Write a protein that binds this DNA or RNA. Structure first.
Ligand SMILES: CN(C)[C@@H]1C(O)=C(C(N)=O)C(=O)[C@@]2(O)C(O)=C3C(=O)c4c(cc5ccc(CN6CC(F)C6)cc5c4O)C[C@H]3C[C@@H]12
Ligand SMILES: CN(C)[C@@H]1C(O)=C(C(N)=O)C(=O)[C@@]2(O)C(O)=C3C(=O)c4c(cc5ccc(CN6CC(F)C6)cc5c4O)C[C@H]3C[C@@H]12
Ligand SMILES: C=C[C@]1(C)C[C@@H](OC(=O)CSCCN(CC)CC)[C@]2(C)[C@H](C)CC[C@]3(CCC(=O)[C@H]32)[C@@H](C)[C@@H]1O
Ligand SMILES: [K+]
Ligand SMILES: [K+]
Ligand SMILES: [K+]
Ligand SMILES: [K+]
Ligand SMILES: [K+]
Ligand SMILES: [K+]
Ligand SMILES: [K+]
Ligand SMILES: [K+]
Ligand SMILES: [K+]
Ligand SMILES: [K+]
Ligand SMILES: [Mg+2]
Ligand SMILES: [Mg+2]
Ligand SMILES: [Mg+2]
Ligand SMILES: [Mg+2]
Ligand SMILES: [Mg+2]
Ligand SMILES: [Mg+2]
Ligand SMILES: [Mg+2]
Ligand SMILES: [Mg+2]
Ligand SMILES: [Mg+2]
Ligand SMILES: [Mg+2]
Ligand SMILES: [Mg+2]
Ligand SMILES: [Mg+2]
Ligand SMILES: [Mg+2]
Ligand SMILES: [Mg+2]
Ligand SMILES: [Mg+2]
Ligand SMILES: [Mg+2]
Ligand SMILES: [Mg+2]
Ligand SMILES: [Mg+2]
Ligand SMILES: [Mg+2]
Ligand SMILES: [Mg+2]
Ligand SMILES: [Mg+2]
Ligand SMILES: [Mg+2]
Ligand SMILES: [Mg+2]
Ligand SMILES: [Mg+2]
Ligand SMILES: [Mg+2]
Ligand SMILES: [Mg+2]
Ligand SMILES: [Mg+2]
Ligand SMILES: [Mg+2]
Ligand SMILES: [Mg+2]
Ligand SMILES: [Mg+2]
Ligand SMILES: [Zn+2]
Lengths: 38, 172, 207, 142
RNA sequence: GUGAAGAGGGAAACAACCCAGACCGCCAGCUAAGGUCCCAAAGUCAUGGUUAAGUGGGAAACGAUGUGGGAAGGCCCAGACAGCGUCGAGUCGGCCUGCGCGGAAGAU
RNA sequence: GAUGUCGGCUCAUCACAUCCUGGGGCUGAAGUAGGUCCCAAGGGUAUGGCUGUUCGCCAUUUAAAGUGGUACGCGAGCUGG
RNA sequence: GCUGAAAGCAUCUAAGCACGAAACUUGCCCCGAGAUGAGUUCUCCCUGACCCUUUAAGGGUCCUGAAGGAACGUUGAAGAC
């Protein structure tokens, strides 16, 4: 999990999702691309 | 929207009660009940936003999808397959209790809920069965959670269809 | 439930394999049920028991009427034990130390010995300051008791000198060494609170 | 003439029973506070308790809006250093549901001896039963 | 300009900010700033919107299919868009703007 | 028309930007052992040599030897290098 | 994580459901009804006359003196008192 103020799609398999008031990047391809805004 | 708009075909041999805001479908494979969000009118079954509800199309689309699954549930029903990968990983069903050997010092003794049923075709396969799509999903996740498929050899409990991505170690 | 006994004193039991077990000897005479409390009347389930004996002239009329309702002889006090769901007792029933026949461990509650007014060294294990090296009148004194203007007070619960001992203490999970119904004795391994002759409450170990 | 003042000896206080079920906590509490103080009576006198006795039933079913059921926090300090304690609204309802209404009303009553006296006329119950049939409380729809 | 050398009302409290300049008395009335659910005087006022964060009631670069409004557009029953030729209505992503969200750690 | 000062001693109390122990994501994570980030303040968190030292260096421990606030906490509590 | 739309797909979340830590609430120990919101249970005790006026939770006289308490004494592994 990357915890950052700037969360972004890093590839075409990344998806932005808001869960429980938190912006997250989930990626099916790359676990390194998983991000949480914080 | 598009999900919600499309009504669900209710077959003969399947019986649908509607009482207040409750659906309780009968049928051969089993029986199932739910209460929906108060923004849904269930009029086949047909689904639609009630007035004074901004979420009503979102709530109707989920209602549609759940009742489609419930009417599948009490007919063909749901099946989930799991595979054990790894030397010494066996499974065995005994009443409502699956017995997993998964390389621990203790045997794992997982008990199935009220109406899920397991079969072990081989020792390295589990085959779950039930009417409730959510519950069979949850049981399958719980079994996978004992030894989630690991990234070096793919060892552990996997979904049979799951494609476990593999990697090699740090180069020396 | 438990029983009320008296601390007789300490001794040892030699085992054949050459272990000396230190024991407290507890005299547990028959506990007589003086009152049964129930949900309907009292709002909780308990027995009240007495044990021992009191001289008639020291039994007040209110005390005597309470014992007379139960149909028991006056003992030296009254104690309650909470009941679990399956536990049932009747007024006038005698309960003996055979209660503990198959109990492996007990908790023992007593009144600790009284040390009177104790300093911080004894009461709280404070460290002494220098005996020498210039120390002026401050060998066993407590040292600082706070900070400065912030917070400009001493906090509640500050460890200071005061009454030590003479209070209820429970020691948990003592091994039952022997239950001797004939002699009204319970032997427990190790020390328990209070002086020789003091009242003890003995209960099966909660842990 | 001098302006009328209510006299503590002669004040008539009626008994009322209110059902908290589904009522918004703070909007119930203001009406309770008003009536415990006697602000609804022409005889209202700031230094006299002219208010009514109020039984509140079903305190455990009082409502709150938004995410307050999980997010409204009740703090108290024990007086011991570090003794800051807290409970959420949902925890307060589970453990001591009458306190939710009592706390809300106390904060809306005057501070001081008379305000404490006014609070004594509020009788809050968790369920649908009270033991004050003898006082013959009138139903009051707040 | 005010305080100093200026009281009264407001800004929780708060010389110097806002309203306003106390000759004395009144258990009359109208207003100012500021207010009108309870503490606490006065709208639980009216009509039309927005916000779901207790935002309001501490907030920066920057981040985001939060949500309201607006002006253009590209493609679309010569079948788009998504998913699997199927398929059968819209779909797509920039700009402008209202209100929110993250960014957000401190000592009784 | 006086708000006692460095360091030590005694006794602390809070914060969390966590040293240990607890939970977890990513890893250029095979395992063992690490790196990094997130959650977490319940409890715990060296003795000595040298020097007034705080610190530091050194010796030898420890699961760890946390970082800060508290009149650089604490002399109507001690010391006085 | 499950199921699941908004957004035919996807999506742990919007509806709904499940896991998840020495933190939190309990569980363990001690205090504790001045908890003035002063609670409960058991037992014990007192079952006499009369006068007066500012008729009132009024005042006094005679008779009565319980349960129990205190005091005093001998004291205590209780204690500064
Ligand atoms: C004195 N009074 C005008 C205000 C007041 O009464 C209060 C209060 N709590 O009652 C205040 O808090 C106040 O005294 C105060 O401290 C303020 C600020 O500190 C403040 C305020 C607004 C700000 C807006 C923007 C910025 C940006 N900074 C300037 C540069 F350095 C970057 C800072 C602000 C700020 O510091 C509000 C006032 C209100 C005061
Ligand atoms: C609500 N209360 C906590 C304070 C308050 O009572 C007042 C008041 N006047 O009575 C305020 O003004 C207040 O509500 C408020 O608005 C504040 C501010 O606006 C404020 C404050 C301090 C600030 C310090 C720094 C900055 C700038 N940095 C960069 C940005 F990212 C943050 C802004 C400030 C600011 O806007 C004081 C509070 C006090 C509040
Ligand atoms: C006499 C004053 C003293 C006792 C000590 C003072 O220290 C000095 O003034 C240091 S210079 C004087 C030294 N000496 C005379 C040569 C007298 C102490 C010192 C440490 C400060 C610097 C000034 C303020 C202070 C109060 C608080 C404090 O720390 C004190 C005064 C108000 C205090 O009375
Ligand atoms: K002037
Ligand atoms: K707020
Ligand atoms: K410290
Ligand atoms: K890690
Ligand atoms: K801690
Ligand atoms: K100082
Ligand atoms: K000093
Ligand atoms: K001082
Ligand atoms: K001194
Ligand atoms: K009491
Ligand atoms: Mg969560
Ligand atoms: Mg003693
Ligand atoms: Mg020492
Ligand atoms: Mg001297
Ligand atoms: Mg000396
Ligand atoms: Mg103070
Ligand atoms: Mg006031
Ligand atoms: Mg001057
Ligand atoms: Mg002025
Ligand atoms: Mg003023
Ligand atoms: Mg201010
Ligand atoms: Mg303010
Ligand atoms: Mg003021
Ligand atoms: Mg007017
Ligand atoms: Mg008012
Ligand atoms: Mg209105
Ligand atoms: Mg705020
Ligand atoms: Mg912000
Ligand atoms: Mg002076
Ligand atoms: Mg942290
Ligand atoms: Mg804490
Ligand atoms: Mg705990
Ligand atoms: Mg050192
Ligand atoms: Mg200092
Ligand atoms: Mg310090
Ligand atoms: Mg001195
Ligand atoms: Mg000092
Ligand atoms: Mg010197
Ligand atoms: Mg779906
Ligand atoms: Mg532990
Ligand atoms: Zn990616």
């Amino acid at each position: 999990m990357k915890v950052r103020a700037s969360v972004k799609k890093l590839c075409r398999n990344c998806k932005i999702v808001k869960r429980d008031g938190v912006i997250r990047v989930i990626c099916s391809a790359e676990p390194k691309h998983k991000q949480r805004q914080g | 929207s598009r999900v919600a708009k499309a009504p669900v075909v209710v077959p003969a041999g399947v019986d649908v009660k509607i009482n207040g805001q409750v659906i309780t479908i009968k049928g051969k494979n089993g029986e199932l009940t739910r209460t929906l969000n108060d923004a849904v009118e269930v009029k086949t079954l047909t689904f639609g936003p009630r007035d004074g509800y901004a979420d009503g199309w979102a709530q109707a689309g989920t209602a549609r999808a759940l009742l489609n699954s419930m009417v599948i549930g009490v007919t063909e029903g749901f099946t989930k397959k799991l595979q054990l990968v790894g030397v010494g990983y066996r499974a065995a069903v005994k009443g409502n209790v699956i017995n997993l050997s998964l390389g621990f010092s203790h045997p794992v003794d997982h008990q199935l809920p009220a109406g899920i049923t397991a079969e072990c075709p081989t020792q390295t396969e589990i085959v779950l069965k039930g009417a409730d799509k959510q519950v069979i999903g949850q049981v399958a996740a719980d079994l996978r959670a004992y030894r989630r498929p690991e990234p070096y050899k793919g060892k552990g409990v996997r979904y049979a269809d799951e494609v476990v991505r593999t990697k090699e170690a740090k180069k020396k | 439930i438990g029983l009320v006994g008296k601390k007789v004193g300490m001794t040892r039991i030699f085992t054949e394999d050459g272990v000396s077990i230190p024991v407290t000897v507890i005299e547990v005479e028959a506990n007589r049920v003086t009152q049964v409390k129930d949900l309907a009347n009292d709002g909780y389930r308990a027995i009240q028991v007495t044990t021992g004996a009191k001289k008639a002239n020291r039994v007040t009329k209110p005390e005597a009427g309470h014992f007379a309702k139960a149909g028991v002889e006056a003992g030296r006090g009254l104690w309650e034990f909470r009941l679990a769901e399956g536990e049932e007792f009747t007024v006038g029933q005698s309960i003996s130390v055979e209660l503990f026949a198959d109990v492996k461990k007990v908790d023992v509650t007593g009144t600790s010995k009284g040390k009177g007014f104790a300093g911080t060294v004894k009461r709280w294990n404070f460290r002494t300051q220098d005996a020498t090296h210039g120390n002026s009148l401050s060998h066993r004194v407590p040292g600082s008791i706070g900070q400065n203007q912030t917070p400009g007070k001493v906090f509640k619960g500050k460890k200071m000198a005061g009454q030590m001992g003479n209070e209820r203490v429970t020691v948990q999970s003592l091994d039952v060494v022997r239950v001797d119904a004939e002699r009204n004795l319970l032997l427990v391994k190790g020390a328990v609170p209070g002086a020789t002759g003091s009242d003890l409450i003995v209960k099966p170990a909660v842990k | 003439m001098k302006t009328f003042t209510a006299k503590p000896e002669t004040v008539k206080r009626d008994w009322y029973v209110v059902d908290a079920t589904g009522k918004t906590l703070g909007r119930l509490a203001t009406e309770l506070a008003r009536r415990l103080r006697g602000k609804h009576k022409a005889e209202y006198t700031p230094h006299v308790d002219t208010g009514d006795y109020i039984i509140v039933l079903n305190a455990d079913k009082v409502a709150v809006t938004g995410n307050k059921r999980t997010d409204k926090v009740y703090y108290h300090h024990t007086g011991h250093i570090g003794g800051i304690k807290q409970a959420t609204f949902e925890e307060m309802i589970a453990r001591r549901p009458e306190r939710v209404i009592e706390i809300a009303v106390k904060g809306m009553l005057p501070k001081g001896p008379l305000g404490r006296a006014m609070f004594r006329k509020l009788k809050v119950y968790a369920g649908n039963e009270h033991n004050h049939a003898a006082q013959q409380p009138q139903v009051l729809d707040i």
